[PDB]
């Protein structure tokens with residue numbers, strides 16, 4: 063159903079992207095950048111500007127329109143928090159295969175409703191909200207991550223954070239390994255794509271030979287991921303998975319920046335997440351500075367270098 | 368965000384949920400007079416702080432227990448005098464407790480039955496979930512641990528809303544008998560509806576009780592409001608003091624800086640929540656004690672840098688500052704210039720370790736270099752960590 067749309071996560075050179083809230087400050091700024099990176103940003107939408115252009119690209123009144131006219135298969139949203147949920151819903155309505163919602167601040171209840179909608183359809187895959195987006199290095203960048211630090215390669219990266227993901231990407235390029243696909247699923251408690259969604263893609267992607275999973279306190283997506291890897295990444299051909307879980311020193315009961323990073327009612331602590339992943343054979347880098355070197359050693363041990 | 372118990376109880380009361388009659392007081396005399404006004408058989412006096420466990424907490428005044436029952440208005444006054452102005456420490460506050468400025472004087476009711484009831488956006492099943500147990504008055508975690516069986520849940524379909532059947536079912540599972548089931552179901556429905564109305568991520572009632580007289584009453588409530596919903600919960604967030612906030616944290620917030628104090632001497636500030644957590648973590652892993660978590664957000668302003676610095680050096684406990692920034696949107700140079708500029712304007716007194724990476728990084732490093740300031744620039748995060756720890760040994 064919805065799990066079917068998991069494939070839409072693997073953006074590539076053929077992905078045609080439209081920016082919702084195109085003429086807004088964020089949409090405009092990141093759109094110029096997507097353009098320069100080489101993303102196939104083919105237009106955007108904003109109500110009332112259909113038939114106009116912005117940054118030399120066509121604008122359409124509705125996502126429906128933009129999609130039909132441009133053949134866009136992906137949409138990105140930078141719209142302010144109060145209006146972001148409706149933007150997601152519009153993309154889901156227009157059946158955009160992939161929607162990336164960067165916007166931080168969407169009320170959790172709005173996301174609970176968007177999730178209700180999302181799970182009862184199989185056309186639209188949502189990445190986000192509150193996330194940096196997704197990037198297939200050298201092929202397609204949708205979001206706000208710095209393109210230059212990414213180098214097409216062999217590591218699939220899925221992470222609940224933004225900048226900590228950048229460290230990991232950087233580390234992997236410094237050890238010369240590169241990334242196959244990087245998906246920031248965001249720091250919100252309710253979102254459109256979880257770790258398992260990405261792991262599934264990574265496990266079956268020939269170009270992904272190793273995986274880095276970056277997590278943090280709050281929720282139990284890390285635990286679910288561990289359960290998933292225990293079942294699906296066992297066997298002679300298992301891919302090495304390396305992880306770092308942030309918040310080992312986080313105090314209980316405090317939102318740690320991200321809306322979803324909180325240890326509440328005794329649940330969501332980092333240690334348990336690390337333990338769970340370890341039992342699933344994931345090599346957990348105790349230091350966030352050593353993800354690149356840990357995964358490199360794993361490739362090395364398996365003579366995959 | 369959490370509001371004080373008296374604020375949460377009024378919201379519930381305003382929304383048809385049954386609570387105990389009460390008045391709020393900020394002085395011992397006012398508590399004494401409120402107790403007389405209640406004209407009740409028995410009065411419950413409760414220190415008002417956000418942390419739970421008040422019932423077993425201790426005050427810096429020597430008083431034990433943050434929740435007391437007494438039949439005498441004068442005792443209410445005497446107890447209150449040992450509360451207002453003092454610090455209440457509980458298993459959920461730090462040892463130096465929290466200052467109590469207000470107390471609730473409510474009408475105590477006899478409790479015939481105590482059950483646990485909560486409504487939360489459950490991260491395990493992407494929707495509101497009714498969580499309940501006939502074993503109330505205790506920590507839900509313990510019941511979960513000891514008797515997972517006594518825990519009941521009803522997943523609610525956000526679009527449909529709570530169904531009569533779910534409410535009735537939960538009412539039965541909580542142990543309310545026939546004549547009261549309906550009353551309990553109704554309250555559960557009103558609680559669910561209130562939960563939604565106010566953008567709560569959690570409404571927890573423990574005990575969700577029964578009195579000998581046949582009244583279904585929410586004796587204690589904790590409501591966690593979704594901070595992301597402030598724009599549409601103006602009136603609710605206006606009630607938030609920020610008074611229990613460690614001062615440093617409130618100053619920081621003013622400048623879109625998310626600070627979380629920890630117990631340590633190595634301060635740090637990073638852009639991005641995961642990185643910020645990872646930064647406190649790596650300090651700890653290298654034998655240091657991070658003084659705080661601080662996320663700058665995504666749009667670093669030399670202002671922020673400056674305030675971040677002003678605020679952290681404000682704290683005497685801080686013996687060193689680790690700055691870990693990974694530049695992208697805002698290139699590292701603008702950042703280095705902010706670092707240097709603040710260094711000059713504040714005359715930093717503790718050692719500073721800076722680790723920048725990302726966009727226009729080289730230039731930024733030249734900035735730090737050409738600045739002539741005693742700023743240790745680290746090779747990477749690990750290095751930044753060992754060096755910052757080295758600084759306070």
Ligand SMILES: Nc1nc2c(ncn2[C@@H]2O[C@H](COP(=O)(O)OP(=O)(O)OP(=O)(O)O)[C@@H](O)[C@H]2O)c(=O)[nH]1
Nearest residue numbers: 411418419420421422423434474475476477478587
């Ligand atoms: N009979 C009676 N007991 C009450 C009433 N209100 C509170 N109590 C009791 O006062 C004692 C301490 O209060 P609790 O609410 O359990 O304390 P707590 O769990 O630490 O409170 P939080 O700080 O909200 O977590 C318990 O034995 C309660 O049952 C009331 O109206 N009547």
Ligand SMILES: Nc1nc2c(ncn2[C@@H]2O[C@H](COP(=O)(O)OP(=O)(O)OP(=O)(O)O)[C@@H](O)[C@H]2O)c(=O)[nH]1
Nearest residue numbers: 421422423424425426430431432433434456457458
């Ligand atoms: N952490 C802590 N709790 C205390 C202390 N003194 C009392 N309490 C708790 O505060 C609550 C009220 O204390 P008291 O008025 O002494 O009542 P009590 O029923 O005699 O409590 P106990 O001392 O446990 O037998 C109870 O839940 C006590 O366990 C103390 O020094 N430290």
Ligand SMILES: [K+]
Nearest residue numbers: 504573574587
């Ligand atoms: K209680």
Ligand SMILES: [Mg+2]
Nearest residue numbers: 425430431432
């Ligand atoms: Mg005692």
